[PDB]
């Protein structure tokens, strides 16, 4: 239903399983949704060639993926031992069907 785009969630950094002992909260942004735009000619050609058994027993994606095309610069927080951390590219900043 909902097309590929940015989503937002408030999260505790200690919830992310990244080893940070901090109760601080960040705004976590990510990419989700459907890719419903008309198929590229590339993808149409690739699907056809796959179906005609012309490809080589390897995993080939003939359909776009909703993924980030750009990431958050940085976000910081103070942990339980009173040490500061800065994490780069934690969140998505832009999304597209790639």
């Amino acid at each position: 239903a909902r097309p590929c785009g940015l989503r937002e969630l408030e999260v505790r950094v200690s919830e992310l399983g990244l080893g940070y002992a901090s109760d601080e909260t960040v705004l976590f942004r990510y990419c989700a949704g459907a890719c419903e735009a008309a198929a590229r000619v590339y993808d149409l050609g690739l699907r056809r060639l796959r179906q005609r058994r012309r490809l080589r027993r390897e995993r080939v994606r003939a359909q776009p993926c909703c993924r980030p095309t750009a990431y958050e610069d940085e976000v910081s927080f103070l942990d339980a031992h009173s040490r500061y951390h800065t994490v780069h590219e934690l969140s998505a900043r832009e999304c597209a069907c790639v």
Partner: protein
């Protein structure tokens, strides 16, 4: 705690979170075993944070109420004092005041602090016109200058703030030095303003 709540509100605001992370990443970055950060650059980033983020976010982090040591240590850490506040050499407060006064903006910010935060013996709050907000703003306005003040320890309710200086080596000017320092360290206006904020 209220200080953790304050960090949350900041991080959930795009502008605050960017300018907060910027001063944190600059102030936290070690240059060499002997130079714990680029101080000038840290101070600049601190000034930018307090100037360009509204006080609704900024004062909440700086002046949040605490009942325990975890909260108070968080509060103490707001300006990343190991870079921005502490120093290998602790100057005489009058020498530091002199240094501050050669800088046009430090001189003016200090004078604002004096005018807005020096205690009155006549008001219920000990602040002039009972104006807590103007004192708090003038206090915050000195962060990122030569006269940068901070919480001296992680005492939760026994708040003591001070610039990084002492009154040792004052010679004959010891009374003058201690009177100057007491506007930070022993000021019922400033005490009450910070306490009333949370």
């Amino acid at each position: 705690n209220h200080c953790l709540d304050a960090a949350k509100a900041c991080n959930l605001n795009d502008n605050c979170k960017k300018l907060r992370s910027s001063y944190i990443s600059i102030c936290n970055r070690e240059i060499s075993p002997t130079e714990r950060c680029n101080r000038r650059k840290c101070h600049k980033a601190l000034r930018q944070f307090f100037d360009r983020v509204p006080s609704e976010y900024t004062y909440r982090m700086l002046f949040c109420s605490c009942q325990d040591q975890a909260c108070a240590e968080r509060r103490r850490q707001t300006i990343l004092p190991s870079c921005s506040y502490e120093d290998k050499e602790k100057p005489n407060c009058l020498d530091l005041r002199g240094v501050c006064r050669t800088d046009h903006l430090c001189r003016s910010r200090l004078a604002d602090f004096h005018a807005n935060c020096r205690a009155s013996y006549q008001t219920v709050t000990s602040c002039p016109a009972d104006n807590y907000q103007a004192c708090l703003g003038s206090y915050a306005g000195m962060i990122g200058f030569d006269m940068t003040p901070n919480y001296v320890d992680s005492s939760p309710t026994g708040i003591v703030v001070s610039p990084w200086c002492s009154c040792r080596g004052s010679g004959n000017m010891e009374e003058e030095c201690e009177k100057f320092l007491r506007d930070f360290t022993e000021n019922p206006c400033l005490r009450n303003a910070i306490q009333a904020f949370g």
